Structure formats: C-alpha cells, structure tokens
CSV table of C-alpha atoms in Angstrom, one decimal:
chain,number,residue,atom,x,y,z
A,1,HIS,CA,58.9,88.1,64.6
A,2,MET,CA,60.6,90.0,61.7
A,3,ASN,CA,64.0,91.5,61.6
A,4,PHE,CA,64.3,94.6,59.4
A,5,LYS,CA,67.4,94.4,57.3
A,6,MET,CA,69.5,97.4,58.3
A,7,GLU,CA,72.8,99.0,57.2
A,8,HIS,CA,73.9,100.4,60.5
A,9,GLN,CA,71.5,99.8,63.4
A,10,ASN,CA,72.3,101.9,66.4
A,11,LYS,CA,69.8,100.1,68.7
A,12,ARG,CA,70.2,97.4,71.3
A,13,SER,CA,68.6,94.1,70.1
A,14,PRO,CA,67.1,91.0,71.9
A,15,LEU,CA,70.3,89.2,70.8
A,16,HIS,CA,72.3,91.5,73.2
A,17,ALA,CA,70.0,90.7,76.1
A,18,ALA,CA,70.2,87.0,75.3
A,19,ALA,CA,74.0,87.2,74.9
A,20,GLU,CA,74.4,89.2,78.1
A,21,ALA,CA,72.4,86.5,80.0
A,22,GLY,CA,74.5,83.8,78.5
A,23,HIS,CA,71.4,82.0,77.3
A,24,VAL,CA,72.8,79.9,74.4
A,25,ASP,CA,69.4,78.6,73.1
A,26,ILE,CA,67.6,81.9,72.9
A,27,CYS,CA,70.6,83.3,71.1
A,28,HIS,CA,70.4,80.4,68.6
A,29,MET,CA,66.6,80.8,68.0
A,30,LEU,CA,67.1,84.5,67.4
A,31,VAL,CA,70.1,84.0,65.0
A,32,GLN,CA,68.2,81.3,63.2
A,33,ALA,CA,65.2,83.6,62.9
A,34,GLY,CA,67.2,86.3,61.1
A,35,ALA,CA,68.8,88.3,63.8
A,36,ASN,CA,72.0,90.0,62.7
A,37,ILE,CA,74.7,88.4,64.9
A,38,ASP,CA,76.7,91.7,64.7
A,39,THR,CA,74.1,94.4,65.4
A,40,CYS,CA,75.4,97.5,67.3
A,41,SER,CA,73.8,98.9,70.5
A,42,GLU,CA,73.3,102.6,71.0
A,43,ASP,CA,76.8,102.6,72.6
A,44,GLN,CA,78.4,100.5,69.9
A,45,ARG,CA,78.5,97.1,71.4
A,46,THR,CA,78.1,93.7,69.8
A,47,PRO,CA,76.4,90.7,71.4
A,48,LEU,CA,79.8,89.0,71.5
A,49,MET,CA,81.0,91.9,73.7
A,50,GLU,CA,78.0,91.5,75.9
A,51,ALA,CA,78.6,87.7,76.3
A,52,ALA,CA,82.4,88.2,76.8
A,53,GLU,CA,82.3,90.9,79.5
A,54,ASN,CA,79.8,88.8,81.5
A,55,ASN,CA,81.9,85.6,81.5
A,56,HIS,CA,79.4,83.5,79.5
A,57,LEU,CA,81.8,81.1,77.8
A,58,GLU,CA,79.3,78.8,76.0
A,59,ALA,CA,77.5,81.8,74.5
A,60,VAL,CA,80.8,83.3,73.5
A,61,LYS,CA,81.7,80.0,71.7
A,62,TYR,CA,78.3,79.9,70.0
A,63,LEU,CA,78.4,83.5,68.7
A,64,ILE,CA,82.0,82.9,67.6
A,65,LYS,CA,81.4,79.4,66.0
A,66,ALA,CA,78.5,81.1,64.1
A,67,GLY,CA,80.2,84.1,62.3
A,68,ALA,CA,80.3,86.7,65.1
A,69,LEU,CA,82.4,89.6,64.1
A,70,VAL,CA,85.2,89.9,66.4
A,71,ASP,CA,87.2,93.1,66.1
A,72,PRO,CA,84.2,95.4,66.7
A,73,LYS,CA,85.5,98.3,68.7
A,74,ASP,CA,83.7,99.6,71.8
A,75,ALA,CA,82.7,103.3,71.8
A,76,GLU,CA,86.0,103.9,73.4
A,77,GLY,CA,88.0,101.4,71.3
A,78,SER,CA,87.7,98.3,73.4
A,79,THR,CA,87.2,94.9,71.8
A,80,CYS,CA,85.5,91.9,73.5
A,81,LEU,CA,89.1,90.8,74.3
A,82,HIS,CA,89.7,94.1,76.3
A,83,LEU,CA,86.4,93.7,78.1
A,84,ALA,CA,86.9,90.1,79.1
A,85,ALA,CA,90.5,90.9,80.2
A,86,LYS,CA,89.4,94.1,82.1
A,87,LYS,CA,87.1,91.8,84.1
A,88,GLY,CA,89.8,89.1,84.3
A,89,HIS,CA,87.7,86.3,82.8
A,90,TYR,CA,90.4,83.6,82.1
A,91,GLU,CA,88.4,81.1,80.0
A,92,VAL,CA,86.8,83.7,77.8
A,93,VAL,CA,90.1,85.5,77.2
A,94,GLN,CA,91.5,82.0,76.5
A,95,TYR,CA,89.0,81.1,73.8
A,96,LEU,CA,89.1,84.5,72.3
A,97,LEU,CA,92.9,84.0,71.9
A,98,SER,CA,93.0,80.4,70.5
A,99,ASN,CA,89.8,79.5,68.7
A,100,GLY,CA,88.8,83.1,68.3
A,101,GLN,CA,92.0,84.2,66.4
A,102,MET,CA,92.2,87.7,67.9
A,103,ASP,CA,94.9,90.2,68.4
A,104,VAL,CA,96.6,90.3,71.9
A,105,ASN,CA,98.2,93.7,71.2
A,106,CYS,CA,95.0,95.4,70.1
A,107,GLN,CA,95.1,98.9,71.7
A,108,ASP,CA,92.0,100.8,72.7
A,109,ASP,CA,91.6,104.5,72.5
A,110,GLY,CA,93.8,105.4,75.4
A,111,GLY,CA,96.6,103.3,74.0
A,112,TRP,CA,96.1,100.5,76.5
A,113,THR,CA,96.4,96.8,75.5
A,114,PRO,CA,94.6,94.0,77.2
A,115,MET,CA,97.7,93.4,79.4
A,116,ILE,CA,97.7,97.0,80.6
A,117,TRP,CA,94.0,96.4,81.4
A,118,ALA,CA,94.6,93.2,83.3
A,119,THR,CA,97.4,94.9,85.1
A,120,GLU,CA,95.2,97.9,86.1
A,121,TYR,CA,92.8,95.4,87.7
A,122,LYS,CA,95.6,93.2,89.1
A,123,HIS,CA,94.6,90.0,87.4
A,124,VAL,CA,97.9,88.2,87.7
A,125,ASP,CA,97.2,84.9,85.9
A,126,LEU,CA,95.6,86.9,83.1
A,127,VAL,CA,98.9,88.8,82.5
A,128,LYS,CA,100.7,85.4,82.6
A,129,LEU,CA,98.2,84.1,80.0
A,130,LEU,CA,98.5,87.2,77.8
A,131,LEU,CA,102.3,86.9,78.0
A,132,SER,CA,102.3,83.2,77.3
A,133,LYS,CA,100.4,84.0,74.2
A,134,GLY,CA,102.0,87.0,72.6
A,135,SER,CA,101.8,90.3,74.6
A,136,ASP,CA,104.3,92.9,73.5
A,137,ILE,CA,105.4,94.5,76.7
A,138,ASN,CA,107.0,97.3,74.8
A,139,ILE,CA,103.6,98.7,73.8
A,140,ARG,CA,103.3,102.3,74.9
A,141,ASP,CA,100.0,103.8,75.9
A,142,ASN,CA,99.3,107.3,74.6
A,143,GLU,CA,101.3,108.9,77.4
A,144,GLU,CA,104.5,106.9,77.0
A,145,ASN,CA,103.8,104.4,79.6
A,146,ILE,CA,104.7,100.8,78.9
A,147,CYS,CA,103.0,98.0,80.9
A,148,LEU,CA,105.6,98.2,83.7
A,149,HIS,CA,104.8,101.8,84.6
A,150,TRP,CA,101.2,100.8,85.5
A,151,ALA,CA,102.4,97.6,87.2
A,152,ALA,CA,104.3,100.2,89.2
A,153,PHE,CA,101.4,102.6,89.6
A,154,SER,CA,99.2,99.7,90.7
A,155,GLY,CA,101.6,98.2,93.2
A,156,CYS,CA,101.2,94.5,92.3
A,157,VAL,CA,104.7,93.0,92.6
A,158,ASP,CA,103.7,89.7,91.1
A,159,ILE,CA,102.7,91.4,87.9
A,160,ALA,CA,105.7,93.7,88.1
A,161,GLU,CA,108.0,90.7,88.7
A,162,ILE,CA,106.5,88.9,85.8
A,163,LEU,CA,106.9,91.8,83.4
A,164,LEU,CA,110.6,92.1,84.4
A,165,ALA,CA,111.3,88.4,84.0
A,166,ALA,CA,110.1,89.2,80.5
A,167,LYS,CA,113.1,91.4,79.7
A,168,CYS,CA,111.1,94.6,80.3
A,169,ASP,CA,113.1,97.8,80.4
A,170,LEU,CA,113.4,98.9,84.1
A,171,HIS,CA,114.4,102.4,82.9
A,172,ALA,CA,111.8,103.1,80.2
A,173,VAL,CA,110.3,106.5,80.8
A,174,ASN,CA,107.0,108.1,79.9
A,175,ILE,CA,106.2,111.6,78.6
A,176,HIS,CA,107.0,113.0,82.0
A,177,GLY,CA,110.4,111.4,82.2
A,178,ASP,CA,109.2,109.1,85.0
A,179,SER,CA,110.5,105.5,85.2
A,180,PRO,CA,108.9,102.6,87.0
A,181,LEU,CA,110.8,103.4,90.2
A,182,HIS,CA,109.7,107.1,90.0
A,183,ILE,CA,106.1,105.9,90.0
A,184,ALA,CA,106.5,103.2,92.6
A,185,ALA,CA,107.7,106.0,94.8
A,186,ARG,CA,105.1,108.7,94.2
A,187,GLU,CA,102.3,106.2,94.8
A,188,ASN,CA,104.1,104.8,97.7
A,189,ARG,CA,104.3,101.2,96.6
A,190,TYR,CA,106.9,99.8,99.0
A,191,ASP,CA,107.2,96.2,97.8
A,192,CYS,CA,107.6,97.6,94.3
A,193,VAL,CA,110.3,100.1,95.0
A,194,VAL,CA,112.1,97.2,96.7
A,195,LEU,CA,111.9,94.8,93.8
A,196,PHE,CA,113.0,97.6,91.6
A,197,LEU,CA,116.0,98.7,93.8
A,198,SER,CA,116.9,95.0,93.9
A,199,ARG,CA,117.3,95.1,90.1
A,200,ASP,CA,119.5,98.1,90.1
A,201,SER,CA,117.1,100.9,89.2
A,202,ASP,CA,119.0,104.3,88.9
A,203,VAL,CA,118.0,106.2,92.1
A,204,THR,CA,119.8,109.3,90.6
A,205,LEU,CA,117.6,109.5,87.5
A,206,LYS,CA,115.8,112.8,87.2
A,207,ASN,CA,112.6,113.2,85.2
A,208,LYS,CA,111.5,116.2,83.2
A,209,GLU,CA,110.8,118.0,86.4
A,210,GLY,CA,114.3,117.4,87.8
A,211,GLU,CA,112.9,115.1,90.5
A,212,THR,CA,114.5,111.7,91.2
A,213,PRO,CA,112.5,108.8,92.5
A,214,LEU,CA,113.7,109.7,96.1
A,215,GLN,CA,112.4,113.2,95.5
A,216,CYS,CA,109.0,111.9,94.5
A,217,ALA,CA,108.1,109.9,97.6
A,218,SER,CA,106.4,111.5,100.5
A,219,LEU,CA,108.6,112.2,103.5
A,220,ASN,CA,109.1,109.5,106.2
A,221,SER,CA,107.2,107.0,104.1
A,222,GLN,CA,108.2,103.4,104.1
A,223,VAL,CA,109.2,104.1,100.5
A,224,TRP,CA,111.1,107.3,101.3
A,225,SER,CA,113.1,105.4,104.1
A,226,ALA,CA,114.0,102.7,101.6
A,227,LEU,CA,115.0,105.0,98.8
A,228,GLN,CA,117.2,107.1,101.0
A,229,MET,CA,118.9,104.1,102.8
A,230,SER,CA,119.7,103.3,99.1
A,231,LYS,CA,121.0,106.7,98.0
A,232,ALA,CA,123.3,106.7,101.1
A,233,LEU,CA,124.6,103.2,100.4
A,234,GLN,CA,125.3,104.4,96.9
A,235,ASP,CA,127.0,107.6,97.9
A,236,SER,CA,129.1,105.4,100.2
C-alpha cells in the first residue's frame, strides 16, 4: 500500500506489529515499501523498542543494520536498551552495546540506568555484562540512590557483591541519609546486611531521621538479631 510521509506520526504502524513479532521478512518488505523505520506509536515507541523488549535478536539486528534510530526515548524516558535490560535479554543488550553503539549510562526519567533496571529485576549476568562494558556505578537516580542502594533494597547478594567488588561506596547515602546497610535492614534482607557487615559498614551511622541501621530493622528479625550482635561486639 502507500505510506503517507509524515512529520511526527503518533500512531502505531504495521512495522511495530512486525517488529514485536520478530518477523524479519515482513519488516523488510514494509521498510522496502516505504515504511518509516522510526515511526512512533501513540505511546512513543519505535519498532526497535518493540523488537528489543520482546527478545527478537534477528529483527533487532535488521532494524539496526538498516538505519533504525536508536536513542528514541520511551514515554517515560526508556530506550530500547532500558527495555531489553529491564527484561534481562542478554543477547539483545549485548548487540545494542557492541554493534549498536549505544550509551550504557543512559538514564530514564526516574534517574535509573540500565544497571539499576537489571538490578531491580535481579538479572545478575546482565549487571555483569553492563559492568564489563562501561556501567558507571556512581550514577545517582533522582532520589540520591546509587545502584548499591537498590541492590540492597532488592536483596540479591550476588548483584550486591558484584557492585562492591567494583569499588562501590558502601557508605554512600541517598536523600534520606540511608546507606546500603540502612536499606538492607528496613527491608529485612539478611544475606545483604551480612555481606555489608562483613565489609565494615558503620552500624552507628544515623540517617536524616536519626535512625541507625539497627534502629530500622523490625524487632526480633533475623536482621535485627544480626545487627545487634554486631553493635554489642563493637561496644565491646
């Protein structure tokens, strides 16, 4: 059929559906027939984003090795790189990093980077990959949290361990004055408060509320019991 030439189209196109299904040929036919490889859906999404988020590697390569615009931002500031990471698609994130020449520290609207996203969904090897290829662990989301704070909030020690082995500040604090240990206590993440204590995290540090990590844990929690055993062994 015919593709009207448009300035800013705000309507989903067949390319999106094809992209989202990962059908490489239909994509080709459409592109070859005039389809704008970068059209935006009503919710501001590019076919590349559709193909990325749905783990369709070959269709991601095609769109890319065909002019696909790559730093389009979501309606909430996410790029295809965020989306693929958020879903933990290793290969897509890989290609988007190497052959796609994209920015690993791109931050969406909430301040989050792909690593904070892969941390939120506990995609270990994706955090490894993002580190191995340039992640700046000092990035601070809009509320002063650096990746470690969320590794803490989440509870995944393997991601928390990995971020520390990357020279990440164990005492960095967000807009509330909370440190990673403060968080790992409130959310009752035992294994985490243990790794943290094992790396000398100040149990006496108060936040902007006056609370210390020990004062943030719930009473008689596994975490409370650990944090106190600690404060006592410190006072001794």
